[PDB]
Paper text:
Here, we present single-crystal X-ray structures of CheY from Pyrococcus horikoshii (PhCheY) in two different crystal forms, and the protein purification, crystallization and X-ray data collection of CheF (PhCheF). CheA autophosphorylates and subsequently donates the phosphate to CheY, yielding phosphorylated CheY. We observe PhCheY to have a domain-swapped, pseudo-dimeric fold, which may reflect inherent properties of the protein fold but is not likely to be of physiological relevance.
In striking contrast to all of the known CheY structures, PhCheY adopts an open conformation in both crystal forms, with the two subdomains of a given subunit directed away from one another. T. maritima CheY and PhCheY superimpose well, with the main deviation in the connecting region composed of the short helical segment of the β3–α3 loop. This region is unwound in the PhCheY structure (residues 54–60) [Fig. 1(c)], facilitating the inter-domain movement. In all cases, the rotational movement of the C-terminal domain was calculated after the initial superposition of the N-terminal domain. The connecting region between the β3–α3 loop is partially disordered for the two subunits C and E. For both crystal forms an unambiguous trace of the electron density in the β3–α3 loop was verified by a feature-enhanced map (FEM; Afonine et al., 2015; shown in Supplementary Fig. S2 for the P2 crystal form).
Numbering used by the authors:
A (entry chain A), B (entry chain A): 2 to 118
The structure:
C-alpha cells in the first residue's frame, strides 16, 4: 500500500495521489524523471510504483538544437563539470555560445555571462 | 539581462539564480528538463539561457530495468495514453506488472492497483 508516484507533470502526480489516497493508500514519494525514480525507489522501498512511460528524454544538445530552431539568435551557456567535454563541444557546435564549469566561482560565471552579451 | 535557468537540480537553479540576481540580472523562468526548457523559451523569449549539459535522459523502459535490477520483486504500473503501446509493451516485457490508461477512470485505476497486489 506504499506507493511511489512518478510522472513529469505535477498535476498528474497530484491527480493520481488523490485517487490512491482516496482508496486508502499512502503516497510515500514522487518523481519528475527516470533518475529520480530509481534513487527514490532505493530510499523508500515501496510496495508499488506508478510510472508514466513518457519521461523526459531530451538531452542538453537536442534542447540547444530545438531552441536554435526556434530563435537562431538564442544565447545559451552550458553548465558543465569535468568529464562532459565531448557533449559540451557538440552543444557549442549546435549553437551554444559558451560554458561555465562547476564548481562555480561567481566571478568566472559573470565574466562568461557578460562575454556572451 | 532576462535569463532562463535550466538544471534538473533545484539547489543548482537556486545557486545560479543567486549569482545572476546578485549581478543585476532577472531570472524570468526555470526548467527541470529539456522539453520544459524549450516550452519556456517560447513563452519567455529570454535574452540568455543557462543549461546543464546533463538533463534527464532516462526513459520509462530503462527506469523499469534499473528498478528490476535493484529489486526483482518490484511491482510497477505504467501510465499510458493511446499511441504509446509499443513502449508499454516493452516496459511489461522488462518487468512491469500492469498499466492504466489516461484519461483515468478512478474505478479502473484501483481495479488495476488491486490486481497488481
Amino acid at each position: 500500500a506504499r506507493v511511489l508516484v512518478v510522472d513529469d507533470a505535477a498535476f498528474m502526480r497530484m491527480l493520481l495521489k488523490k485517487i490512491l489516497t482516496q482508496a486508502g493508500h499512502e503516497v510515500v514519494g514522487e518523481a519528475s524523471n527516470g533518475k529520480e525514480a530509481v534513487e527514490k525507489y532505493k530510499q523508500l522501498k515501496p510496495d508499488l510504483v506508478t510510472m508514466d512511460i513518457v519521461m523526459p528524454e531530451m538531452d542538453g544538445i537536442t534542447a540547444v538544437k530545438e531552441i536554435m530552431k526556434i530563435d537562431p539568435n538564442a544565447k545559451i551557456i552550458m553548465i558543465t563539470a569535468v568529464g562532459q567535454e565531448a557533449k559540451v563541444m557538440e552543444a557549442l557546435k549546435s549553437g551554444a555560445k559558451g560554458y561555465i564549469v562547476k564548481p562555480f566561482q561567481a566571478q568566472k560565471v559573470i565574466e562568461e555571462v557578460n562575454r556572451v552579451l
